[model samples]
Target: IHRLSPWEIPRRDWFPPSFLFGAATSAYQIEGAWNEDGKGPSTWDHFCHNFPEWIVDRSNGDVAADSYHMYAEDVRLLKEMGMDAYRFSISWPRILPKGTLAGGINEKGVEYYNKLIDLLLENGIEPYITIFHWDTPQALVEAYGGFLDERIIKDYTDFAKVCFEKFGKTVKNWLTFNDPETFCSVSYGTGVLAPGRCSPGVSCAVPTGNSLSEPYIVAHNLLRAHAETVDIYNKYHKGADGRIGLALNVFGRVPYTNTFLDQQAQERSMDKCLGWFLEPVVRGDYPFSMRVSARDRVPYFKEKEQEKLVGSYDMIGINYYTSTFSKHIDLSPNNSPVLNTDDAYASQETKGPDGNAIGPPTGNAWINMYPKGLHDILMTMKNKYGNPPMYITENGMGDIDKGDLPKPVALEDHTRLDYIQRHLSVLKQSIDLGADVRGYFAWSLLDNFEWSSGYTERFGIVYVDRENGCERTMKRSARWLQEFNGA
Candidate 1:
């Protein structure tokens, strides 16, 4: 089932006329220039420089692909690939060096984005902008506690207003935040990411924080920030043609067995992982299971806040990767508090009851090749959330980073081609079943800095030569995409 049969391969025209195909990249992950052009330092810049040991290879994104200076080359690559659009993020610190409206705007930062946007349009490529992609300005963190503080709502809203005023006319599709669930849990719960904070005993850069409560607090603030920003856009900034939403990362979940308890565990896993942030936007409250599990640890939404949250978006962006089996677990009262992953009381297992893995393994241990998960999660969204317009925002896997592998061998990425083809097959299936999916964006365009793993995991359709002035070379997968799109 893991192998994509020839008959299952998707044709370009199988999708509707309006369907879009694009590639995505983040600011911190791709754009280097950690401090230049009047850019304020982000929490990621601070984290990587101060705690290099926290990264797997002790590497940082000081000059990641040199995209900051070579964005025209990136746009040219997208044009060569025959992509309909290019999804990227605007660095907050690049625009507002101090992370607040009163701090003054950087005209050079504004000029840089203007150039990129104008270039994309000049190449007939639509731009999809993500407002915040986990690079909080270090100035904000130093002033307060970043997302943990309610004060961030005002600052974030001001930032959004600036973007709307500057780029609203050109950029029609705007995503407020990218993967708040992963950002909060990884940054606050496990503390493996920037502004690393976790339980006092956890092994992380800054271990003097509360894992049980901080993740929830950060998520709460993020939701508020998203809703308030959207409120402003809908009321003042948004054009009749523009749309706004947030990107959420959801993993497909399967019950460990046919038992009712296991089924319930699967639902709980979804609630804790996806519903933690999603349910609030859909229903204006956290999942019932999360409310019960976290109890006082989770923040409560006021009546006014609920009004702002419910139906905040014209569309939703889903970042699907893989699926896992959820086995039910009962936590004891005496158990130590560390990770918010425990709040679900369900363990994610790769192997099923018969000791067989769920799907083929990928280079990254966390991601498996599970195409059916894409269809299942899409149907779930359609049925549970009123079939809102959606997009497959991020779907792709990384290649194995073998030091001995030659550049030619890495460029011949047949596995990635198959992975994309199989997932596109499932994506077409989901759309045929009445899911309102409008677009699909591959995870990345170039092999840039992968957090924690550093540059070891290559998830790009194009190979970036780090040692050779960030030379760009299209991989086999990129060629396949070009041919699929009738280049």
Candidate 2:
């Protein structure tokens, strides 16, 4: 119809073919010149290097899948993969240097991004830029307690405005923040993430080491930052044709056992995870559950702030990985039973769309691999949120693909390819059933430094040899996608 798969896409397609077909990467995860030029240390640089004991691979992102010096190489990879677009995040610290415009722009950092953007346009690939990808500058966190302090709203917005002014012309799709829920939970919920903080001892059943109210405050600020950026673009940079949104990862849970207790656990789980952020951006208010739980966490936004939050996105971005089955436990550890169990009857564990036992064989630490869960979540959003044209901004499978190296060979990862095939089939099903899914971008273009888990988890379609400065080997999935995109 518009600009989708030119050969296979038809005018009657449910999706507006004008959407995107892309792959995604975040700066901190890929761009590895950690201390090069004028770039300051991000929370990641300090955390990974400082606590070498935390990462499973004892691998810090010090040299990560070094895309910093070779973004041209990244663009070449994207072109070879036949991607219509690339959704990579701009490191906040890299963009802002010290997290503030007052620190003056880092010309070197600006030029680095300018060069990357120029290269992407030259290659005919649209750039989908995410302003913040959890790489909050350690300087900002140390100075004023980070997102908890409302001041981050101004700082983040200023940083965003810079990107809009710099690359807004060529980069049309802008994601305000990547996975606010993840950053809030993993970063602030516990001291586990850098600048980690346990909520004041007053709340939380988990010891002081668990995640907490920071998600709410961080979300509020995140919304404010998004709204402010939207406002800035709406006013000043309107001339630059672009769309802005946010990316979120969620699990669609179904009741494992059809018991009344298990059903309730399902509802509670989603209420806390997806709705917690979606409601604020879509409905212009926080979920009643979260508001009640975190009444005293952050000051309630005034009516003016509320007005800015609703309808702030040009589109909604989704990052789906897995689904789960929720079952209530009466005597589980901590509040595992009460906290994990929900009342919404949305358990996604035992049952699936076709009613099969789904997800990975053993589950990926915290996430289960339910490819159809992507379909469930898309349908859920369509039914509940009125199908505001959507995009799979980040979605992919992880496998240990780096096991093979310098033996004069290419890579073949059938497991991840199966994951992609199954998920895409589910996505196509969602489209046929009218869910408004536009395009899908695999979570990564190449294996980079995975956070917390480090490089142990490989989620790229293109395998990068870490030992040899991210020497890339095209995997079977990459070749398959090249064909899928009609290359």
Candidate 3:
């Protein structure tokens, strides 16, 4: 068997039996009832509708995978795959039509979630809830500046408390926000995602944002919101059961060359991305690298807030995709203060000094196969932060969504199969080396809406035939997982 194929077949017995196996998805990406059943508009709805040209295919998640109506089918697919858990998010707009308790709760939204949780429990799958995943209430965005203002701290905490009181008993794991880095940088810095805002005269929907300073401001508010929510959870629901954390999209990094300048660039790149959030959670402030580089531009917390910031999580969720080669930039302070990532004093590239890619290229441009980067990131966590429980919240590569591709060719995706197997192998290695990794959840379960990419890219292991009855068929990777889980 070893000689017949280059890929190693991952076996379930390699790791702890209690370790979790699951697939991860979000509400806006999968459950597309959009404006249905008393559901109010989220920032995503406002973005896709008001500016159709922003999305790659001019498509929104209005009818997405239709999991809204056929969620049982999604559960059935997970069950059939032998998954032990399901990680999904709650839509804030659905739960609170106006994004606040003063507007009253939407009973229908609660009913839908209750039915979904019950169905998963019935089928022996644990429910992991992500409290917020970048779907800021459009109402909040208009009323104030959404995350830009400190007023969101109380409102976001209120939303989290409602979820804890409502679903805390059934859901044992809670993630506060999906990727606040991306949320702050892309939505504010680049002005691409919802509630889009950038510097005036930029090429985005709303160019009124101070890209350099706005992201830092938004991040400060998010950290506050996360701390308050965790404070609420620890005070009440965290007694006998449950854990709380936030998901961060941290990209792996390596120096572009062996030079000292490149090495410094790599360190700051890591600092700006991973350490940006990790330092605050583990210790009570932002990383020294960022604090020095950002100077007075970055925000600081008070003593009372620092107490809430420290040890806010029982686990850490990392959505890792690829690594880049970091190259040196001049260390001079920026007088312009117009870009977000510029403060890091680095530029990230996909290739090294040899003019070669970091790893083999996949169908998607962003992800390159570099399993060692994942292992290195984990080992650094173990050595640095005392090895807290962690989860690979999202890990998968996307295939170009060429509409005319034949069904058989699409279903037998060998590239994706290789990607999953290699990543799974690396996770086992991480555990073997004492990293305290607890679970592995693939990026998606079906070909659903992928943010601004719309339907132009497919990141699903299960093929959803949108043109033919919304039928779902397992690709090679899902089938491989079925066998691995069953074993």
Candidate 4:
């Protein structure tokens, strides 16, 4: 529906030359070698194989975009786009085949990443790495519920330490975890994502987890993992000029109506999403709204954890896509919460009370276009949390699955072109408003394994020819990006 541009086109010179520009991809989402080269199984590998029903197409990332083999070509794509950097994740099970220091390392996995990183370096494209992108090695999951118990704090720290040891010299930017909120709430609360778990009444592949409390527990451990890993980096790896951050995802929340209830709902929604992790990294505690809503159910940080957490991140990575209207959901003595998401006491709506959509609806049901949301979220980074250096780690929209759409029409991707330009325009306005945002990265470079929906959804600027050699084609959006970057 976003066929026409309502915003000015963004120019490369609008941003400082030092401001980086790139695209991002996760390991399981793009890399194929799911179990090759001594790589052990990731929870995603196990989840897709064991509970294929959870995925819409019953498909797994077995081959994905085959970046595991075609990474050199991917680098060439970035260089052709004139991208300044490329953000990708290293598979835990791929590198640490056993998910532990005691287990031997897989040099082959290390070799693959090294080849990609060196190619990126030689091509003038910097590399950004996400230490853990929601794929816990299945070994760790089976050993001690991944991100559930306190013991994970130690194991996760060891994993990050190994990453620092192996790739710290050139990989100056690292995200300890990517969107842990989505990982915890969706995987544990709704049981839709990998390592699926949910309560019995909830609809999910596995129905044995506590939907109300387990999410908070996993969230606590995730933050603890970040705190400890960053602390270790500061202690041992500080001299390397490496910076660590956490990638957080959230829908920009707006009050559904001009009332106190909706305003409060919006505030609470932000606290539940952004503040849940950002506050901890910046201030050493969870948001007060979270403490109130979750009560004693949300774990409190110890003094040591607080000390390690305060100012832990030198930067932040925001994976923003869309905005939502926050309508207050009333609570009552008889009406109890069923899932952790219910604790927010707000409902995310794409339409407001007037029956008007928030913005132009996209092929993605959840992501209604709203560029103002980006400006608002960036201002929040400046006005609320201390202005830390940040990057729009992921910002892209997926198109609806077209059954008989021809190849030429698919490659047009005009709506995606509109989406990228509008967001970049808003980002420029945000920078003008004094947010310390350092860079921007589109969500993906190529169509790959979109979790849950699989290949039914495409969020890439470049289309992957899955039926023929997995050849990549630059969609019109990518051509726009190439010329914008003066390639």
The prediction achieving the highest lDDT against the true structure is 1
lDDT of 3: 0.87
The C-alpha lDDT values of all candidates are 0.90, 0.73, 0.87, 0.89
What's the ranking of the predictions by TM-score, best on top?
1, 4, 3, 2
- lDDT at 454 for candidate 4? 86
Question: Could you estimate the TM-score for every candidate?
Answer: 0.98, 0.88, 0.97, 0.98
**Cα displacement (Å) at residue 99, model 4:** 0.7
lDDT of 2 by residue, 304-368 (tens): 86787788787888988777777654433443211111223233455454577655542145545
Off by more than 4 A, model 2: 1-19, 199-210, 329-357, 362-367, 401-410
- Which 10-residue window in model 3 sums to the lowest lDDT? 1-10
Question: For residues 1-487, what per-residue lDDT tens digits would candidate 1 score against the true structure?
Answer: 2456777778899899889999999999998988899999999999999999998888898888889999989999999999999899988998999999899999999998999999999998999999999999899999998898999999999888898899998999999999999999999989999989998889999998988889999999999998889899999877688999999999999999989989999999999888887899988999999988888988888888789999998899999989999998867767654688888888899999999999987778688888898888889889988988999999999987747657898899888888899899889889999999999999889998999888888999999987678989999999999998888
1-487 per-residue lDDT for model 3 (tens digits): 1111444557888868999999988999889899988898999999999988988889998988888888998999999999999899999989988888898888899899999999999999998899898898888888897888998888888889888888888888899988888888888888988878888877788888778888899989999888888889999998887899988888888888988999999889988888888788889899898989888879999799889999999999988888889999885545444677878888899988889999987787678888778998898889988899999888888888757767787788788888888888888899999999888899888888888888877888898888886788999889989998993
Model 3 spans > 4 angstroms off? 1-7, 333-337
Enumerate residue pairs that collide in model 1: none
Instruction: State the displacement of the C-alpha of residue 31, model 3, in Å, after optimal TM-score superposition.
Output: 0.7
Candidate 4, residue 65: CA error in Å?
Answer: 0.6
Candidate 1 lDDT at 43 equals 91
The predictions' CA RMSDs to the true structure, in order, are 1.3, 5.1, 1.9, 1.4
* Residue 54 in candidate 2, Cα distance off native in Å: 1.2
